[PDB]
Amino acid sequence: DPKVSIDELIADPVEVVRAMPVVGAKHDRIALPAELFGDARTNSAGLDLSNEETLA
Amino acid sequence: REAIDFLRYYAEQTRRTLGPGHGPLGPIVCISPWNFPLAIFTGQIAAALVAGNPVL
Amino acid sequence: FGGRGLSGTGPKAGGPLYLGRLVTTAPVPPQHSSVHTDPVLLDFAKWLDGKGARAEAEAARNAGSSSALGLDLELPGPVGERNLYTLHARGRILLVPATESGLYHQLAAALA
Amino acid sequence: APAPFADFAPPVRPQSTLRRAITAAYRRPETECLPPLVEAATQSKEIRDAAASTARKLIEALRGKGVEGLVQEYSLSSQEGVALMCLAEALLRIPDTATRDALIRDKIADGNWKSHLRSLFVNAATWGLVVTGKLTSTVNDRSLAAALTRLISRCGEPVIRRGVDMAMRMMGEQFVTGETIREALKRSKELEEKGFSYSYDMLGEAATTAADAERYYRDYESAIHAIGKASAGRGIYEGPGISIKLSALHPRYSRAQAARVMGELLPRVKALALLAKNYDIGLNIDAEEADRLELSLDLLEVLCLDGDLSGWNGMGFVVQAYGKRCPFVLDFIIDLARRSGRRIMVRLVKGAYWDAEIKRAQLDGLADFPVFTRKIHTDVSYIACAAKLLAATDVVFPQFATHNAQTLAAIYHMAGKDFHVGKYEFQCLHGMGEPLYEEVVGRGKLDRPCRIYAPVGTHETLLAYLVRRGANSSFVHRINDPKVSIDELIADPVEVVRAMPVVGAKHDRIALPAELFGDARTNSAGLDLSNEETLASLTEALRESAAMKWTALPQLATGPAAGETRTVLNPGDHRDVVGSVTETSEEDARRAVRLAADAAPDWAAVPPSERAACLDRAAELMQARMPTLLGLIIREAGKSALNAIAEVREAIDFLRYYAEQTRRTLGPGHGPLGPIVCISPWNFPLAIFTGQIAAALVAGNPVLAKPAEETPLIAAEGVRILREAGIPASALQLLPGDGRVGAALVAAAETAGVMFTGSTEVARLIQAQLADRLSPAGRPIPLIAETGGQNAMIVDSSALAEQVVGDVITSAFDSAGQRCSALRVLCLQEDVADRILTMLKGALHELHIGRTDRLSVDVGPVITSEAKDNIEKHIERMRGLGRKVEQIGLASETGVGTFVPPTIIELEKLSDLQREVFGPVLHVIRYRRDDLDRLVDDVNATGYGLTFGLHTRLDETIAHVTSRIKAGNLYINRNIIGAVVGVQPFGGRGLSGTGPKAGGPLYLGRLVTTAPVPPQHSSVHTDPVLLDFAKWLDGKGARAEAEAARNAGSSSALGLDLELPGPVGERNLYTLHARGRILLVPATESGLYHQLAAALATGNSVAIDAASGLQASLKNLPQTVGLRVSWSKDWAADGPFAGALVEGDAERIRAVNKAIAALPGPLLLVQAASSGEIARNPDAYCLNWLVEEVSASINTAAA
């Protein structure tokens, strides 16, 4: 992409993350499964049948 | 999960719509099948109840 | 969820028209509207005004506006899926009128 | 006899060095503007540190302290909140409080809201922006009506009462300081006691009529007295002042009208300034669009040098930092302050018209934007200009208008520690800026004064331009964004810009005007008639064009020919000889066709890409020669300078568009038709001339170019340029003359196609001549005929009257109404008809009619004395019938030419208009809202269908009207003229043309024997009746025909729906619909099945010739198909048709073609094939010509 500069491509992800206001914040545009419907209602939750804690 | 979703969905649709002028029918008979013995059981009953009808 | 014909009466379970069937006066569902006006409804309203059926012509225009025929919505769901919800004509409606004005109102409702 | 162009556009005054440096910067590249701004805005490390600390303290205070609470309390959706506020607005229009409360309790809260209360939702776009922060140009009124019913039925009277209270506080206290100057002055006492001052804005702008300008004047005058009485001698710094907009004070405030501006607007501003002087209050001239900047400087200079205003320093002037001229404007103002001895109050702002400036520059094809395209550049400009102002506080009073805490902090620290009242001040808007400046004003804060810009006006005026008064880039929006840190807000724009890879790079997502079409083609370039350097250069080029010995000769392949020579006269002044034309003999016209036939193989053998290169080279020559071509068009055709620019641009666009379409499509299998006769009109004597010729030439055909008798000189110059670009003389022959020349060309045996733009009557005569002939392959001779229209605009009660009037004045009277697209019938909803008509008449009388070699002329002459008499006979007949007729008085100087005064005629019914009147004559009818659908029927019933306009904010009305109107070019919330090549492909249906659209992708395919597949031309939609018909065919055993039908369903492009690239603030849509009812003339059963398949696959119904005897071939059709099929014994009784499909041998085809040409109404596009061709060729009939192209152009900046 001619828009992206070498400075952008060379940025250190470790230091960019360290400087964020909440380290490790979820992507703003990706809904947690519980939040798929926004403020309308809470999505039902399932169970992970691949999780050994859950199976036990 | 579907039973939970029915409950929460008809709850939210009620909060969005129902007013004093939306009078109930009265006693509603809810007859449900054996293949979705909780989810369709719950969906029909929850809808009838939240609309202000007592259910058989 | 729910179909037509031998599959059921509707309205769809888990959809926005469901609760309205369970009250004596149905509410306006969320997002339930359409900017489309059925063109045969419009032709019927002009015919009614040519007759001087002013009350019915007005009723027909109001039916044409409040109809949600043509609604076309995307419903929120998971990524990698598009979930659409649309309102179409039902088909042929049986009209059992008693009076001329009753028939005009019924026809307006069906055409709209 | 005045010398041509001797008075074209003389400047108000000789341009000083300082004024010239302003003009030079008008559209300077952004990469050249920014580096000196960066340097000027550069501050020391310590100052930048202190500034970042101050901005952090202010932004922290701001974050640690309405409609949102109402939405929350009642669990309202966004649409419900908007609908509620629209309902509250309407309830507040009820005068008496107890009446309103009774209606709420006894009627509204019971759901009966439609009964008592124009749509409720006319201003929903504004409330939408209030509620959601998002703007839309139009309003989904069905969604809002559903939401309003829902929320009332759910929450009842309590939510209505809360909405009413909220809207009342916002409209009477938050959007405006006060409803009247008296009220606003009473409400200012509080913050004045806390150290603020005020500047009152009476909200006038963009006067449309003399009466509007006078109303705004008397509003300003009364406010000045009220403010001066309240000021009570506090002076211009501590006391309140007023802000005025020059556009409010004259209906024609523009550079083109500079003489009227200096003679009529200037004395008005002087009278207001004299009253402000007497009370010793500030009077600030607000800044408006970029093309008014330098004109406003001429007024500022006169006022500041006027001795009657001496002794008063209250005169103020706004400069916009988003403008590239801003620092040079400041240099000029500071020097003016020194010369005059007046301490000019200079309000530095960023600027309020950004979106409109981007759109305008793109529309006008100008070199660059007059504003920056990156918000951060505007911020650097602001700081840079503030530095210049702070160095000049001894001679000007700087006023730093900003809500941006970082900008504020930077300036505060830049100004240093020495301060006193009168050195400089900050400014902010009422409602918006007080939270910030409460942290600034006062000895306990930053101890810097702030002046509050206080809008004053009622609910009508406020809601008008409140939208312009919340974008993602705005500080006020970003400070409210929780995902924006303070560190992002206190970031130094100066140091951010300095570290970018290319300082001053244009915004990546905004196209320069020349790049509007990307890699497809280079946009044509215009000229800026507000730029004094351009006007000076153009004046000289225009005078030179009038010293040229323009000629037009019959230019045959063998050389020029002799003939009868006559002079060509300026229609605006018959004393002004423009040139001479030598007209073609009937014998030489026929000789030219034979010469063109002889040369046809040679030109067809030139590879399509090289033919396109000729067109592209011609476009470059026309662009380079534009100033000279303008001069010829102005004098030969009677056009104004702006319209000649558009005409030359349109010619360039056609050349480049058809060149690119050729490079996209044409190969060796797309053989030319042969010699094409191109007959062009006098109203677009270069653009339509060039378009037809270029299309035919690039499709591989040699051309016989017959220009209108009235306008041969620009045609000859167009041919000269095309030959210079490489078109051989044998491929392009010019044949000037009258209809005898046109008729000889059309009748010549080797004529293989005719392109005609002109009257319907002449087009019908050409069709009759062509129906006698067949091509060498036995097909009808193609005719592309673009004819008139009876074009209408429908305006409902939701439209903005001022926007309607400007679009109506332009659409009806531009080019003296001699556009095929010109607005002929305006339909006004009855509730707003009187108000709009009054404004329209007032606007009519502000037009300047005269010889067009003056920039001040709005409307020129009609083309001939015959045109004038025809138009005036219509007007007198209407007046004779007692219709109300409004006309402007013409100057005596018009007697030397042929002028018709712009005219408004009020009709009882659309049926009163029974003829096309090709002149500046607007007919007006009124309609009731419930009759809208019938009105659309009345418009359609004319049989025309070229251009159509709709002004409404209501989506339900848009959907209804645009689905019912039958017109080729639709325009929503804009004028209906000036269709742009490749953007609004142009061409109508019915009596308005055959199609295909000029400047569209089907055009070239009509000019070859085998049409190519156009770019982007396909559809995934299959007509369902076609599908029913194919199954029926299979049921009957017609298996091959069923397969051909399925293939037709797939190949059809019915349902194509494209958005075409164009300027920002507009959506341009291109769609393919069914044409209507196609006349089928079959010979065999299989031929009928193939014809029906072609018609059904393109969405059409059919009328089948009953004389074919093929009725038994369609037994037991599915009802869906039967609904589409009728049988016709009397073709002329069962029309109008939209096309025809014919099967037969050559004699049968000729006989049918002649019978179809005799059908009244539209010229039918006829396709013919033999029975054997139907069997052999799947494309025997071409589906391109069985659909209808529709172009829709929607103004999305309209709210």
Ligand SMILES: Cc1cc2nc3c(=O)[nH]c(=O)nc-3n(C[C@H](O)[C@H](O)[C@H](O)COP(=O)(O)OP(=O)(O)OC[C@H]3O[C@@H](n4cnc5c(N)ncnc54)[C@H](O)[C@@H]3O)c2cc1C
């Ligand atoms: C008291 C007062 C009087 C005013 N008078 C006038 C007037 O007479 N004429 C006038 O035109 N304006 C005037 N304005 C300014 C205008 O109305 C806006 O209020 C002002 O531009 C907001 O800028 P800011 O420093 O508040 O906010 P910010 O968020 O700092 O600045 C926003 C501004 O940046 C600019 N901008 C946004 N995006 C871009 C971009 N992509 N490229 C380039 N620039 C961009 C725009 O000018 C926008 O208004 C006045 C403002 C005030 C406070």
Ligand SMILES: NC(=S)Nc1ccc(F)cc1
């Ligand atoms: N003014 C012109 S060119 N008229 C014309 C052309 C061809 C024809 F058949 C009849 C008339």
